[PDB]
Each structure stands twice: as structure tokens, then as C-alpha cells.
Amino acid sequence: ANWGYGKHNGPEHWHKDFPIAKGERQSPVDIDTHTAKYDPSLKPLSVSYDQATSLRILNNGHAFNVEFDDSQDKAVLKGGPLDGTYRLIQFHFHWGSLDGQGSEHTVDKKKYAAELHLVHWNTKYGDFGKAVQQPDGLAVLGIFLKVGSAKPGLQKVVDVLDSIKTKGKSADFTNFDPRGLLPESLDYWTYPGSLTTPPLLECVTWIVLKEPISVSSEQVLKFRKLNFNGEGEPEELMVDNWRPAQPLKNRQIKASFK
Ligand SMILES: NS(=O)(=O)c1nc2c(F)c(F)c(F)c(F)c2s1
Ligand SMILES: [Zn+2]
Numbered sequence: 001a002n003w004g005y006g007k008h009n010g011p012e013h014w015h016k017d018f019p020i021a022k023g024e025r026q027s028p029v030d031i032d033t034h035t036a037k038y039d040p041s042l043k044p045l046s047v048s049y050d051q052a053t054s055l056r057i058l059n060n061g062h063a064f065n066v067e068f069d070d071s072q073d074k075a076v077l078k079g080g081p082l083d084g085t086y087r088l089i090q091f092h093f094h095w096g097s098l099d100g101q102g103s104e105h106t107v108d109k110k111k112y113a114a115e116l117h118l119v120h121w122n123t124k125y126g127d128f129g130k131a132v133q134q135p136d137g138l139a140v141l142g143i144f145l146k147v148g149s150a151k152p153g154l155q156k157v158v159d160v161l162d163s164i165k166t167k168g169k170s171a172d173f174t175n176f177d178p179r180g181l182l183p184e185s186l187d188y189w190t191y192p193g194s195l196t197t198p199p200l201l202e203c204v205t206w207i208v209l210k211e212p213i214s215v216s217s218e219q220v221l222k223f224r225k226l227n228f229n230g231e232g233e234p235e236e237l238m239v240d241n242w243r244p245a246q247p248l249k250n251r252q253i254k255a256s257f258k
Contacts, residue, residue, distance in 0.1 A: 003198050004062065004228065006236070011243045018198045025202040026246040027193035028104035028142075031253055036189050039254040045186045045207060046079040047141070047179075052088060054176035057160055061167035061228055062197060063092040063241055066157065066176060070121070070128075075178070077120045077139050080207055080256065081190040086120035086139040089128055091178060093117070094196075095223045097239040099147045102220075104196050104242045105208050112144035112212055113220055115242070116181060135192070137203040143183065144212035151215045153180020158222045167230045183211035187257035196243045210257065 001009045003017065015021035052075035056067045067090045068075055075088035095114035096102030103112035118141040121131040131137030145151075156176055163171045187210045194202045226238035 005241050006228075014198055014200065018200050020194075020200050020202065023194070023200075023202060024249050025192055025194055025251065026200065027196045027204060027206060028106075028243060028245055029191065029193065029248050029251075029253070030106045030109055030245040031189050031208065033108050036253040036255045038258050039256070040258075042081055042190065042254060042256045043079040044256070045077070045141075045188060047077055047182065047186065049075045049088070049177070049179050051075060052178055054173050054178070056170055057157070057164060057173040058170040059164040059167055059226060059238075061230075063094065063238070064161065064164060064226065065090040065092045066173055066178075073123065077118070077141060077207075080188065081205055081254070082139050082207075083136070085123050087123055088118060088120050088178070091116060091118045091181070093145070093223065094242040095145075095220060095239065096242065097224065097237075099217075099220070101240065102242055103144055104245075105142055105144070105206075106245050107144070113147050114145040114215070114223065116143045116145065116213075117141070118143075118178065118181075132195070132201050132203045134203055136205060138195075139205045139207060142206060142208040143181065144209070145215050145220070146212045147217050147220055148214035149216065150219060151181070151213055153177065154215055154219055158219050161222050161226055165225070165231075166227045166233070169231070181213065183209060183213050185209070185211040187211065187255075189253050189255050191251050191253040193251075
């Protein structure tokens with residue numbers, strides 16, 4: 001059992017190889033909006049993506065990653081609850097088989113159709129493999145998707161998916177501007193958590209935006225035509241690649257907004 005989402009290797013099995021799955025600071029979590037406390041000490045986030053250099057899109061068998069050049073400080077996330085500078089390395093999504101499910105975080109138990117994660121690492125640790133071993137090593141910006149109007153800045157991602165249908169396929173993906181994926185408002189909730197796939201390391205400051213972005217039915221239908229399987233293997237549609245909410249334990253979710 002290499003892990004996945006399937007009928008026999010999904011999230012409820014992961015603890016057998018990755019015992020941290022039952023740890024004290026796992027992600028994702030349900031955000032109870034009545035219990036999250038406004039923290040007037042939190043700053044506006046700084047999303048600095050003007051110089052972002054996208055390179056490649058890859059179907060890794062679990063999702064697809066849009067990869068960036070993080071060999072210098074092009075695209076960075078700073079401020080909000082963060083100290084120091086976090087470099088963008090990739091974004092990816094989680095989504096469902098239908099619009100009623102797909103997000104990993106939930107909001108008062110509401111599940112959104114999908115969730116985008118912009119993954120960043122703390123440059124004080126020099127590289128990503130080092131950063132994931134530190135409690136403050138990563139900052140993941142989480143943005144919910146709901147189905148409604150098309151998102152114009154998502155269409156270049158949708159259009160390339162037919163070329164990376166199966167696991168291990170990749171394609172060029174230069175000059176993509178991730179600012180086209182942000183909502184209007186940067187209001188957010190934040191809490192300390194983890195990677196949501198194995199190895200599930202507890203190295204993430206989560207920053208989850210309150211305002212979802214809207215994508216069209218047609219756009220999310222194309223996500224659901226991807227495959228978990230490799231070329232020539234029996235087809236396993238890449239859908240429901242999300243981990244369910246985990247116990248909040250001894251953690252406080254803070255709101256940036258009153
Ligand atoms: N699903 S997630 O929390 O956004 C997320 N997980 C992981 C992960 F487990 C890794 F090993 C890794 F190198 C990543 F870049 C991410 S990014
Ligand atoms: Zn993710």
C-alpha cells in the first residue's frame with residue numbers, strides 16, 4: 001500500500017505508514033467561524049508575485065503541481081502571521097467528484113468544490129527539504145473554489161490538463177501569473193498545522209482566505225478528467241483527492257478581520 005485516496009489506501013489508512021497522521025497539529029481542520037478570534041496583532045498579508053517565474057506543470061499521481069523557479073526570491077509571501085520571507089515553490093489543488101465536496105478545510109462544516117494551495121518555504125532554512133523539518137518551515141496559502149462564473153486566470157491551467165492526463169506526465173508551463181488566482185480580499189484565518197498528504201509533516205503555518213474564488217462548472221469538469229493512473233493503465237479518474245478535517249486539539253484559529 002503506497003498511499004492515495006482510493007478505496008483501500010485513502011486517508012484513513014495513512015497512519016499505518018505515517019504515524020504522525022494522528023498527531024497534535026494535523027491539517028486540514030474545520031474552521032468554526034464563531035470560535036475563531038480576531039487578532040488585531042496580525043498584519044495584512046504581503047503577496048509579492050510580480051516576479052513569479054512558472055516553469056512546468058506535472059501530474060504527480062495525486063494532483064497536478066504548477067512549479068516555480070524558487071532558486072531566488074522572485075515570488076514571496078510575507079507578513080500576516082509570518083516572520084521572515086517564504087518563497088513560492090508550487091501550487092496545486094484538491095477537488096471532488098461533485099461540487100458538494102473537494103476542499104480540505106471546511107468553514108462551519110461547509111465543504112467547497114475545491115481548494116487551491118500556494119506552497120511557500122522559509123528562506124531562513126536554505127532549501128525546501130530542510131524547511132519541512134521545522135515547525136515554521138512552510139506557509140501554505142489556501143483559497144477555496146466555488147462553482148459559478150469562470151475564473152479567467154485559471155483557464156490557462158485548465159487548457160493544458162489534456163496534455164498531462166496521467167501520472168508522471170509533465171508539460172512546459174512558463175509565464176503563468178498566479179495573481180490571476182487570488183480573490184479580491186486577503187482577509188484570512190491562520191493556524192499552525194501540517195502537510196495534508198504524506199509525509200504529513202507538522203511544518204506549516206496555514207493561511208486560509210475567507211473569500212472563495214469562483215470557477216465555472218466547465219473548468220472544474222476538466223480537473224475531473226485527469227487520471228491517478230499512469231499511461232496505458234486502467235482509468236482511475238483523479239477526483240476526491242482531499243484529506244478530511246482533522247482534530248483541532250490544542251490549537252487556536254485566529255482571524256485577520258473583525
Ligand atoms: N497538500 S498541501 O499541504 O498543500 C502539501 N503537501 C506537501 C507535501 F506533503 C510535500 F511533501 C511537499 F513537498 C509539498 F510541497 C507539499 S504541499
Ligand atoms: Zn494541498
